[PDB]
Amino acid sequence: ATAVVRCRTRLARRVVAAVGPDGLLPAPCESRVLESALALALLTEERAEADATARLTAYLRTTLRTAPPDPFQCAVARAVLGAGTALDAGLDGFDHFTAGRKRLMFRTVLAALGATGFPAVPWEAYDTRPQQSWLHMEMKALKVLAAHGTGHPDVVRDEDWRALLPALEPGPAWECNNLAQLLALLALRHSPRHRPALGDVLKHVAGRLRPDGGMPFIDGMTVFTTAAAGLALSLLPAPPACVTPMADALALRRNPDGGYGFHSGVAQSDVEDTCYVLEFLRRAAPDRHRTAVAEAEGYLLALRNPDGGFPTFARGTSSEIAMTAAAASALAHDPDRREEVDEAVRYVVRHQRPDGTFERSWSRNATNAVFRAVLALTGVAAHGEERRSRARAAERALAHLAATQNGDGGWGHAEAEPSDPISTAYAVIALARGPRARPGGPLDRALAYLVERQHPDGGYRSRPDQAGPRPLLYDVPALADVFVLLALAHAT
Numbered sequence: 001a002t003a004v005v006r007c008r009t010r011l012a013r014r015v016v017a018a019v020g021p022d023g024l025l026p027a028p029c030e031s032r033v034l035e036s037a038l039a040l041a042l043l044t045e046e047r048a049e050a051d052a053t054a055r056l057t058a059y060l061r062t063t064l065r066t067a068p069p070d071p072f073q074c075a076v077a078r079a080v081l082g083a084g085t086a087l088d089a090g091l092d093g094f095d096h097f098t099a100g101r102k103r104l105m106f107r108t109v110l111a112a113l114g115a116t117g118f119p120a121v122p123w124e125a126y127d128t129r130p131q132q133s134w135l136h137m138e139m140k141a142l143k144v145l146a147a148h149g150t151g152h153p154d155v156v157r158d159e160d161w162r163a164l165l166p167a168l169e170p171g172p173a174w175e176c177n178n179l180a181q182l183l184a185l186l187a188l189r190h191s192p193r194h195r196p197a198l199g200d201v202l203k204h205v206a207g208r209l210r211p212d213g214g215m216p217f218i219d220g221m222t223v224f225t226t227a228a229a230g231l232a233l234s235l236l237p238a239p240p241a242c243v244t245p246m247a248d249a250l251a252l253r254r255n256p257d258g259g260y261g262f263h264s265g266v267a268q269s270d271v272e273d274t275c276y277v278l279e280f281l282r283r284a285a286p287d288r289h290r291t292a293v294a295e296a297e298g299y300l301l302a303l304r305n306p307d308g309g310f311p312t313f314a315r316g317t318s319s320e321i322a323m324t325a326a327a328a329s330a331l332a333h334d335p336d337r338r339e340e341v342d343e344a345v346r347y348v349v350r351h352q353r354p355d356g357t358f359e360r361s362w363s364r365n366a367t368n369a370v371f372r373a374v375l376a377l378t379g380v381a382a383h384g385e386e387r388r389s390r391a392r393a394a395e396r397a398l399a400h401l402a403a404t405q406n407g408d409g410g411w412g413h414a415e416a417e418p419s420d421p422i423s424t425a426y427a428v429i430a431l432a433r434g435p436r437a438r439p440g441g442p443l444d445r446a447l448a449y450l451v452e453r454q455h456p457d458g459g460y461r462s463r464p465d466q467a468g469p470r471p472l473l474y475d476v477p478a479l480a481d482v483f484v485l486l487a488l489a490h491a492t
């Protein structure tokens with residue numbers, strides 16, 4: 001068969017072999033400068049864990065020497081190893097509804113580490129609506145830090161301290177979020193009422209160091225990765241048998257609200273994880289997991305905003321394009337919810353930008369939202385005026401992909417970035433919904449790119465695309481193989 005099919009096959013054997021007997025594809029997260037710096041600062045002011053703080057220091061210097069991250073994280077590392085131009089630079093026109101909260105978050109962090117002055121804002125600026133559980137704790141921690149850092153500790157209300165109590169529980173980070181626990185602990189250490197519980201958690205934070213001496217942003221993304229892998233495998237001509245244990249492992253980890261978190265032990269459900277599990281289960285076990293499917297469908301239908309879109313975590317927060325398209329695709333299978341599906345799709349078409357693109361949210365490349373939108377625009381059957389409206393929106397999106405394709409056949413994070421396999425995989429999934437591949441065509445060139453970039457061990461090593469907190473990148477290496485396999489499975 002073709003070189004693409006041969007590439008697909010080798011990659012699928014690799015992905016299958018990585019699924020564990022428990023039905024999960026391990027997806028650990030790499031060390032990140034930001035959390036290693038916060039961990040270095042915490043352990044250093046508490047004068048604890050000399051061994052671990054020595055490693056964290058060597059990791060920070062080496063990473064800055066050999067693999068510098070964005071200017072914000074560099075300023076954070078430089079601030080702890082020892083800058084307002086770094087905020088302007090890290091958020092270079094960060095186009096997103098969170099930009100205001102982020103400018104506050106990131107400046108308060110830098111100030112907490114002694115790199116700049118705290119923001120001259122009313123204390124209410126740190127007040128955030130109920131959303132993901134970790135955001136509320138993070139804003140409360142930064143409010144505390146700002147109150148002690150500026151010399152006004154009497155400003156801290158007892159409802160602020162209360163929000164940090166999960167950080168003092170033993171074991172792994174609450175919600176698997178290291179940044180959130182490290183921020184809470186940096187605030188908690190200023191409270192004598194809470195220092196008794198602090199020694200125990202410093203020993204478990206210190207034991208989280210990865211072999212390279214760094215601290216990961218999160219524990220991992222095994223649910224997100226397993227679901228994505230299972231969905232890719234179930235789109236092969238003949239799916240491997242292991243999709244059944246994978247589906248079982250996902251379904252038994254669902255949260256009380258019927259949604260799914262990104263990792264084992266994450267109580268916060270989100271729309272992105274839920275849609276991948278739902279799409280996957282509907283193909284590999286619609287009957288064996290009928291109930292899980294129906295509960296996940298009910299979860300999404302409860303998050304839905306009145307404007308037709310879907311948020312990531314909690315209704316009432318801004319709808320997002322990628323999430324709205326993802327939900328429309330996952331909800332389309334049942335004809336009971338065609339009203340909600342069409343309204344979601346219409347939301348997608350209204351927010352398409354004049355150049356045919358959509359948004360940069362949880363992925364730092366434009367192709368991610370393009371591929372979500374194109375699937376919804378072309379997967380949800382329509383007729384008459386609507387079919388023509390959606391086909392036009394899909395054409396403009398695929399055309400934007402063709403306009404920005406690089407000579408080597410791939411796409412980068414942005415139009416003038418060098419190609420990377422993940423950004424290209426997203427593009428391929430979308431292009432696979434356009435016209436059939438012709439020689440020299442955009443999709444044809446994209447497949448060849450993926451073929452050439454395959455590693456002798458059958459896998460892919462790609463620049464990461466995941467953001468969190470946005471726009472900060474974090475690296476889950478296992479996602480590369482999965483998303484490329486997802487692309488090759490749609491395209492072949």
Ligand SMILES: CC(C)=CCC/C(C)=C/CC/C(C)=C(\F)COP(=O)(O)OP(=O)(O)O
Nearest residue numbers: 098132224262270272273362467468469470
């Ligand atoms: C799983 C995917 C790909 C989509 C849904 C969102 C999730 C679970 C992302 C990955 C896991 C975490 C903790 C974040 F990136 C979230 O980080 P934050 O809540 O600090 O991000 P801001 O809201 O501050 O931008």
Ligand SMILES: [Mg+2]
Nearest residue numbers: 134135138469
């Ligand atoms: Mg955040």
Ligand SMILES: [Mg+2]
Nearest residue numbers: 134179180469
């Ligand atoms: Mg976070």
